[PDB]
Amino acid sequence: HHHHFNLPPGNYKKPKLLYCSNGGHFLRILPDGTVDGTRDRSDQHIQFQLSAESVGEVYIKSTETGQYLAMDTDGLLYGSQTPNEECLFLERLEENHYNTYISKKHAEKNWFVGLKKNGSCKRGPRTHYGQKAILFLPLPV
Motif Nuclear localization signal: which residue numbers? Predict the structure, then answer.
C-alpha cells in the first residue's frame, strides 16, 4: 500500500452530500460533466451515492445525472458517463474525523479530490496530505 488504512465509519446505504470545510462548499458534478463546489445546499447536483468496490475503495456517483466522479491523467476531476479505472477512489479517514478521497489510479502520487476556498476543484498534483482542501464531511441529503 501507498497509504494508511484508517477508514471512516458508516456505510453507503444512503446518498450523501460531500461537504468541504475549506471554503464551505458542497462537491458538485454538473450535467455537462463539469466538477466544482457550491455553497447552495439546494443544488440538485450535489447528491451522491457512494459504493464500495473493494474495502476502502469507492465509486462516487451523481444521483441526479448518474455520472461518476473521476480524475484524469492530468489530475483533473470530471464526471464520467461510465465507470472506469479513473473513477475509483481510496476513501480514508483524515484528522480522525474527515473523509479523504485518493485517486486509486494515481495513488502513488498522492492525488486527492479537493476544493479550493473559491469552490474550484484542485488539480491532482496540487493536492497533498496536510491540506484543508482535501477534507470532506459526508452529510445527509
Answer: 13-16
C-alpha 47/C-alpha 33 separation (Å) is: 14
Residue 115 bridge partners (DSSP): 121
- The torsion angle over the Cα atoms of residues 43, 82, 112 and 63, rounded to 10 degrees, is 30
Q: Which triple of cell numbers denotes residue 86?
A: 479513473
Q: What is the rounded distance in angstroms from the CA atom of residue 112 to the CA atom of residue 101?
A: 6
CA distances from 113 to 5, 119 (A): 17, 13
- Interior/surface letters 9-39, b for 16+ CB within 10 angstroms, e for the rest: eeeeeebbbbbbebeebbbbbbeeeebbbbe
- Residue 80 is classified by DSSP as E
Beta bridge partners of 139: 17
Q: In the numeric block, which cell numbers belong to residue 50?
A: 457512494
Ramachandran class of 31: left when φ > 0, alpha when ψ lies in -120 to 50, beta otherwise: alpha
Instruction: Tell whether residue 99 is among the known ligand binding residues.
Output: no
Number of Cβ within a 10 Å radius of residue 61: 22
Experimental method: X-ray
Domains of the chain: 1-141 (2.80.10.50)
